[PDB]
Design a binder for this molecule. Structure first.
Ligand SMILES: O=P(O)(O)C(O)(Cn1ccnc1)P(=O)(O)O
Ligand SMILES: O=P(O)(O)C(O)(Cn1ccnc1)P(=O)(O)O
Ligand SMILES: [Mg+2]
Ligand SMILES: [Mg+2]
Ligand SMILES: [Mg+2]
Ligand SMILES: [Mg+2]
Ligand SMILES: [Mg+2]
Ligand SMILES: [Mg+2]
Lengths: 338, 338
C-alpha cells in the first residue's frame, strides 16, 4: 500500500521540472536541461527522495505540516534524487557502464557522449536552485546547503578511493582488503544514500543538535554499508531486468565486496585463477571469475551476511533511535532488507 | 611592479593545499586531491584570484584589513581559481583539448583519463570546504556560498549553449549568428571571470546592495564578453607558447567570434569554402578556414573591435563605477586590454 506515497512524490516532478525550466536566449539550454532531468531523475525507485517526505511527516507536528511546508519537503526529496542523478551520470561514464534504470546510460546515447559531464554538473546546480527558490527564508536554509555540499564532498572522496583502488589493466589484488573496502563504501555510498535524506528531514523539523545527528549517523552509515555490499553482490548475481543495469565490477577491476570475500577464502591456485582473469574485458575471463565465486559459496556467504547485518542494524536502532520515532529507521530497514 | 602582488598570492597556495589535505583511511584520496590541486590550479596568471585580493584592499578600510581578514581575502581568491580549475578540467575533456597552461591537459595524462571528471568535481568541492573553514562565522558567508553557486550555474548554462551550438560532425553555420554568440559568452565566461571575483570582494567589504552589484555587473559583463572574444581570436591567431594551449574551435565546430565575423563578410563562394571545411579534424581543412579568415581581414577586424571595446568599457566605468573606487575596474581593464 506504500505505492501511494510514491505516486504523490512522482506527481510533483512535473512541478520541479516546470519551476527549473522557467530569458529566450537560454531557451535551447533550458530545453536540454529538461531532457537531462526527464531522462535521469525518472525510472528509479525514488526511495532516497521519498525518505525525506516520509521522515518529515514522522518528525514534524501535523499542525506545522501545512501545504507550503509539505511542498518544501517534496522539493528537498527531489534535491536528494538530483544529487544521486548527478553522481550516477558521471559514475556511468567513469565505470564505462552500458545501462541504468532499464535504458542505455545517458552518456551512451547517440549525440550525448562526453557532453554528459556538463549535464551531470547541471543536475547538481538544480539542487541549490530549488533550495533557494523554496527554502531561502527558512531557518534551516544554510543547514541544508551545507548538508548537500558535505554529502557531495564525502561521495567524491569515496569515488576517488573507488577509482584509485581500481586502476584499468593493473593487477591490484593485494590492495583488495576488508579495511580498504570499508573505507571506500563509507564515503562513496553510505553518507548520501541514508544519512543525507534523514538529516535533511531532521534539519527541516528543527532537529539540528550535533548528538542527534551523530546518533542518526551511527544507524544510517551501517545501513549504507549494507546497501553498497548488496549493490556489489547484485552487480554479478542480480537479475538485470530487476536491477535495471548491467554489471561491470569484474571488467573494471573494482574492489568489490565479492572480490574481497573471494580473497579471504581462495586457495593459492584459486588466487592465481582470480589474478589471471580479474580486471579484463574478455567475457570468458569474467565467466571464470563468476565460476570461482560460485565455487567459493559467495552467494550463501552474502545471504548469511544480509541476515547478520539486518540483526546488527536493528540492534543499532534500539541503541540510537531515541528520541526520534523508531518508525523513521524501521521503514528504511524494511525497504532495504526486503 | 605588479609581480609582487602575484608572488604573495602564489605563496599562499601552499597553505591552501596543506589545509585541504589535513583520517588515515582517506590518505590515498587526499594524496590524489593534492596532485589534482598542484597540477591544475598552478601554471596560470592568477588574475581572477588576484582580483579578489586587490579589490578587497581597495574596498575595505585599512584599519579593518587585519591578518585574518587578509587571509580570508587570499582564500576566497584561491576559491575563484578553484572554480576556474573545475570548469577547465571538464571543458578540456568536452572540447577534446590537448594542452593547457603549457602542459598536457590533466585528462590526457596517462593513467588519468575520464577519472578527471571526479577530479574536476573535487576541485569544485574544495571551494565550499575553504569557505566553511575560513568564512563560516562571517556575516557575508551565505552571500559568498550563493555567489559561487550562481556563478557555477550560469557558467554551466553557457557551457550547455556552447556544446548545443557546436554538434560534432553537423554543419551548423546558419546557427552561428551574432545574437547566438552574445548569449553563449554572457553565460559561459563573463559571470565567473569578472563579476565573481569583484562581487566576492564587495560582499567581504559589506557592499551587499542590489543596485551596487547591478552597476558593477554592467561594467564587468562587458569586460567578460571582450575577454571571451579575445579568447576566440587567440584560439587560432594566438601564439601557443604564450597562451599555453592549442586551439580546437574550428575542429570542434564552435560558434567562435571568428566564424560569426566570417559569415558577416563572406561571399556565397567563401561561405561554401567555410561550409565544406569547418568542424572537421583534417589539418588541411582547418588551414583552409584560417586562410579564409586572413583573406577577410579578421585579425584587423579584431584589432579594431579591441579598440572600440576598450573605449566602450572605459565609458561604462565613468557611468557605473560610483560609489566604488574607479581603480577597482581600471586595474582590471589594464590587465585584460594590454
Ligand atoms: O558500483 P558503483 O559504486 O559504481 C554504483 O553503486 C554507483 N555509485 C557511485 C557512487 N556511489 C554509488 P552503481 O552500481 O549504480 O554503478
Ligand atoms: O573556448 P572555451 O569556451 O572552451 C575556454 O575559454 C574555456 N571556457 C570554458 C567555459 N568558459 C571558458 P578555453 O579556450 O580555455 O578552452
Ligand atoms: Mg558504477
Ligand atoms: Mg562507480
Ligand atoms: Mg555497483
Ligand atoms: Mg575549451
Ligand atoms: Mg569550451
Ligand atoms: Mg577558447
Amino acid at each position: 500500500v506504500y505505492a501511494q506515497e510514491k505516486q504523490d512524490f512522482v506527481q510533483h516532478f512535473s512541478q520541479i521540472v516546470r519551476v527549473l525550466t522557467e530569458h529566450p536566449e537560454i531557451g535551447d539550454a533550458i530545453a536540454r536541461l529538461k531532457e537531462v532531468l526527464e531522462y535521469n531523475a525518472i525510472g528509479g525507485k525514488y526511495n532516497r527522495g521519498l525518505t525525506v517526505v516520509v521522515a518529515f511527516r514522522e518528525l514534524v507536528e501535523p499542525r506545522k505540516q501545512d501545504a507550503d511546508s509539505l511542498q518544501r519537503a517534496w522539493t528537498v526529496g527531489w534535491c536528494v534524487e538530483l544529487l544521486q542523478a548527478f553522481f550516477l551520470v558521471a559514475d556511468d561514464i567513469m565505470d564505462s557502464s552500458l545501462t541504468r534504470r532499464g535504458q542505455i546510460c545517458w552518456y551512451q546515447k547517440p549525440g550525448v557522449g562526453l557532453d554528459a559531464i556538463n549535464d551531470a554538473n547541471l543536475l547538481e546546480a538544480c539542487i541549490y536552485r530549488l533550495l533557494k527558490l523554496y527554502c531561502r527564508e527558512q531557518p534551516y536554509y544554510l543547514n541544508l546547503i551545507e548538508l548537500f555540499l558535505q554529502s557531495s564532498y564525502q561521495t567524491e572522496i569515496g569515488q576517488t578511493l573507488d577509482l584509485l583502488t581500481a586502476p584499468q589493466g593493473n593487477v591490484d589484488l593485494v590492495r583488495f582488503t576488508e579495511k580498504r573496502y570499508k573505507s571506500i563504501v563509507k564515503y562513496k555510498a553510505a553518507f548520501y544514500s541514508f544519512y543525507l535524506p534523514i538529516a535533511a528531514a531532521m534539519y527541516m523539523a528543527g532537529i539540528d543538535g550535533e548528538k542527534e545527528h551523530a546518533n542518526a549517523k551511527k544507524i544510517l552509515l551501517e545501513m549504507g554499508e549494507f546497501f553498497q555490499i548488496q549493490d556489489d553482490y547484485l552487480d554479478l548475481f542480480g537479475d538485470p531486468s530487476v536491477t535495471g543495469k548491467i554489471g561491470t565490477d569484474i571488467q573494471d577491476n573494482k574492489c568489490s565486496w565479492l572480490v574481497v570475500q573471494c580473497l579471504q577464502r581462495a586457495t593459492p591456485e584459486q588466487y592465481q585463477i582470480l589474478k589471471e582473469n580479474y580486471g579484463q574485458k574478455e567475457a570468458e575471463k569474467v565467466a571464470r571469475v563468476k565460476a570461482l565465486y560460485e565455487e567459493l559459496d559467495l552467494p550463501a556467504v552474502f545471504l548469511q551476511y544480509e541476515e547478520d547485518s539486518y540483526s546488527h542494524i536493528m540492534a543499532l536502532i534500539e541503541q540510537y533511535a531515541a528520541p526520534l520515532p523508531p518508525a523513521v529507521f524501521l521503514g528504511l530497514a524494511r525497504k532495504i532488507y526486503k
